[PDB]
Amino acid sequence: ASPFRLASAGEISEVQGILRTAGLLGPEKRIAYLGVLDPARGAGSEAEDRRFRVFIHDVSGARPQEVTVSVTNGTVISAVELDTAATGELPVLEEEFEVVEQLLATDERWLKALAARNLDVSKVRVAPLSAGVFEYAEERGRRILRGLAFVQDFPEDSAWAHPVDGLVAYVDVVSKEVTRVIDTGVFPVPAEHGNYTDPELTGPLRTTQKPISITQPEGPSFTVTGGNHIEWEKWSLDVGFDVREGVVLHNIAFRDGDRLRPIINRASIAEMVVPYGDPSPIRSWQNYFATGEYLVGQYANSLELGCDCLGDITYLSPVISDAFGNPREIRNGICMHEEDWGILAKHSDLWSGINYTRRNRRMVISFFTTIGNYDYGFYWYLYLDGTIEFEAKATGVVFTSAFPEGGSDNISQLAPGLGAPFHQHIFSARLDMAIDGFTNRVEEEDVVRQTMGPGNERGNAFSRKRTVLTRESEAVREADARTGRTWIISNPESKNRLNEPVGYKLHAHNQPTLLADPGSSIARRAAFATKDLWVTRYADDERYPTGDFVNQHSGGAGLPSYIAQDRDIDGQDIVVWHTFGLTHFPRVEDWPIMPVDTVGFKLRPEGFFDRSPVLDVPAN
């Protein structure tokens, strides 16, 4: 009966029925987004009213709508007509992926471009990329997708090995017309194939790898109740799933003695964008918001035991809605398991003669998604010592282009004539904090060097300083690796036995943030990505760092708009938004399929406990 339970297939079908009966789901309508709404602040309202938020698209051109329904009472709470030119277009539909290639296949301009390159139209795949907002005035208010071509020689061929450069087209997916076809010139289509399962490329397979058996004879140490409530080594939380954000962690708390102490109310990857840095007009508009525009959760893969998740795994199979309101299950889309994590603590004392060693462990909650050529793994880890960590694993196939004759300062060569445009993968972790409760504050902590002189005659002293962020206008911070800058979230009203406010310290990887010029469209639409850390006052409707309707929005939505309210965040219900990402200059080693690369962050207890919380761990 948990208010945080995963949505059932029945609830989805109930939303469908409510919408249809209300006359909001005609033949021309499509569900572009559907998700359950979290419980509002305050549980004083016995029996939670299960509500769902829905974005309804109209393939007829009619205005779309945002609808909220109660599956509990079978009613439509609200239905608001959207003006996309003002607030943004709805997320891209999977069924729209094919329309780009299909429409172009009958366009004379496109056909002429392909004929000139001697490419059989039946073998040309077209990637349906988001449009963004640029200098095309005729696109405002229109639902546009841009297409880039790749050649697939045969059904099982990897089209990514054969990009068709110097060509790009724009299509209005609703009116079903090709608005523009740009051909800047012919570029040879890379000839080598990139079929990583082809023996001629892989060569003889290795026979040297001996098996590694990971098992748990007595089963896992964690328990799963209510379908998604996890309890493991003092940790307690609920594993939620949203079609847009993917896996979401709720009510992260730690059992310290006789009390369950909250740490984070809600943790999620609220956005992830991949901005490309190639100035060619064929790709200079390319910026794909995996989360906001495509909805990464809907493309979650079914994870195979022994391949994707090794060991004793407990799966969760979330249900989402298809474009028509029918429930669709993502079988084994979420993996949960615990794993050994080396040494936790160790000391051999010369005076006491006592030799002490203890092992560490981590609870893993993960899912893997695929968006076109990219595949991303999202991993959340809980450690015995109280540490919380997130790790993203980027793999898949690199987005390609031709490698220019004469070289390039924005593309790397991965194969003869094959290029890989420079780009970044930037994530935004939204952490609705609740350190021992909702009354929290954030302090920026910098290392402080000291000058040799009075009080520091030997010049060995060094210190640290903490600055409380009191208002949102001063809560947009940048990293500073050189001064070991971190951010501490504490509760000024809850102190440890040393009379110090309890807290948690966020450690960032300090990777570069958005590189695009400050005046670029992407810098405006993905403003969150320009700074490492933002702190806002909690608000029900402030869900994503980029706003609710990212697709084709002019910019400034999300964080920049939230921060503009300049609200008090000193000892209040606050939310931390951490930006982190990878800057990718593709290597030859990334081709034909790339080895996983990683990025993330972690939070470690900072005077949260009265002493080490792992003194009760056995020797085993």
Sign of CA dihedral 146, 152, 155, 158: negative
Cβ 451 to a copy of itself, closest distance in Å? Answer: 6
| Contact flags string 540-579 toward Cu ion, x per CB under 5 A | ----------------------------------------
- Cα distance between residue 570 and residue 33, in whole Å: 35
Name which of 477 and 584 has its Cβ closer to Cu ion.
Answer: 584
Mark residue 462 as left, alpha or beta (left: phi above 0; alpha: psi -120 to 50; beta: remaining).
beta
- Residues with Cβ within 8 Å of 130's Cβ and at least 6 positions away in sequence, in order, are 92, 145, 146, 287, 288, 289, 293, 294, 551, 552
Task: Write phi, then psi, for 147 (nearest 5 degrees).
Answer: -125, 135
Q: Does 584 bind Cu ion (CB under 5 A)?
A: yes
Q: Which long-range contacts (CB under 8 A, 24 or more apart) does 56-61 make?
A: 56/19, 56/24, 56/25, 56/29, 56/30, 56/31, 56/32, 57/29, 57/30, 57/31, 57/32, 57/90, 57/93, 58/28, 58/29, 58/30, 59/28, 59/29, 59/30, 59/174, 60/28, 60/174, 61/174, 61/175
Cβ 597 to Cu ion, closest distance in Å? Answer: 7
Of the listed pieces 36-44, 138-146, 202-210, 581-589, which binds Cu ion according to CB under 5 A? 581-589
Q: Which among Cu ion, a copy of itself, none contacts residue 80 (Cβ within 5 to 8 A by kind)?
A: none
Q: Which among Cu ion, a copy of itself, none contacts residue 149 (Cβ within 5 to 8 A by kind)?
A: none
Name which of 118 and 355 has its Cβ closer to a copy of itself.
Answer: 355
Cβ 584 to Cu ion, closest distance in Å? Answer: 3
Q: Which pair of structure tokens corresponds to residue 171? A: 């299509």
| CA within 13 Å, CB half, 305 | 13
Q: Which among Cu ion, a copy of itself, none contacts residue 13 (Cβ within 5 to 8 A by kind)?
A: none
Q: Which among Cu ion, a copy of itself, none contacts residue 44 (Cβ within 5 to 8 A by kind)?
A: none
Which residue, among 244, 243, 269, 268, has the nearest Cα to 328 in the 3D structure?
Answer: 243
Q: Which among a copy of itself, Cu ion, none contacts residue 209 (Cβ within 5 to 8 A by kind)?
A: a copy of itself
Name which of 422 and 549 has its Cβ closer to Cu ion.
Answer: 422
Residue 381, SS3 per DSSP = strand
Q: Which among a copy of itself, Cu ion, none contacts residue 139 (Cβ within 5 to 8 A by kind)?
A: none
- Cα distance between residue 408 and residue 404, in whole Å: 6
Name which of 51 and 584 has its Cβ closer to Cu ion.
Answer: 584
Cβ 286 to a copy of itself, closest distance in Å? Answer: 8
Name which of 266 and 584 has its Cβ closer to Cu ion.
Answer: 584
| CA within 13 Å, CB half, 27 | 0
User: Which residue, judged by CB position, is nearest to Cu ion in the bound state?
Assistant: 584
Cβ 300 to a copy of itself, closest distance in Å? Answer: 11
Cβ 531 to Cu ion, closest distance in Å? Answer: 21
Name which of 20 and 393 has its Cβ closer to a copy of itself.
Answer: 393
Q: Which among a copy of itself, Cu ion, none contacts residue 500 (Cβ within 5 to 8 A by kind)?
A: a copy of itself
Cβ 370 to a copy of itself, closest distance in Å? Answer: 5
- Cα distance between residue 408 and residue 456, in whole Å: 53
Name which of 543 and 584 has its Cβ closer to Cu ion.
Answer: 584
Distances (CA, A) of 476 to 147, 434, 471, 541: 36, 20, 10, 20
Q: Which among a copy of itself, Cu ion, none contacts residue 308 (Cβ within 5 to 8 A by kind)?
A: a copy of itself
Q: Does 283 bind Cu ion (CB under 5 A)?
A: no
Q: Which among a copy of itself, Cu ion, none contacts residue 584 (Cβ within 5 to 8 A by kind)?
A: Cu ion
Cβ 581 to a copy of itself, closest distance in Å? Answer: 11
- Report the site for Cu ion in 432-491 (rule: CB under 5 A): none
Q: Which among Cu ion, a copy of itself, none contacts residue 182 (Cβ within 5 to 8 A by kind)?
A: none
Name which of 36 and 414 has its Cβ closer to a copy of itself.
Answer: 414
Cβ 528 to a copy of itself, closest distance in Å? Answer: 17
Cβ 408 to Cu ion, closest distance in Å? Answer: 16
Mark residue 11 as left, alpha or beta (left: phi above 0; alpha: psi -120 to 50; beta: remaining).
alpha
Please report the DSSP string for 458-494 in residue order.
TS--EEEEEEEE-BGGG-EE---GGGT-EEEEEEEEE
Name which of 324 and 585 has its Cβ closer to a copy of itself.
Answer: 585
Q: Which pair of structure tokens corresponds to residue 413? A: 């060569």
Q: Which long-range contacts (CB under 8 A, 24 or more apart) does 106-113 make?
A: 107/169, 107/178, 107/181, 109/169, 109/178, 109/181, 109/183, 110/169, 110/178, 110/181, 113/167, 113/181, 113/183
Cβ 53 to a copy of itself, closest distance in Å? Answer: 28
Q: Which among a copy of itself, Cu ion, none contacts residue 111 (Cβ within 5 to 8 A by kind)?
A: none
Which residues of this protein are in contact with Cu ion, per CB under 5 A? 584
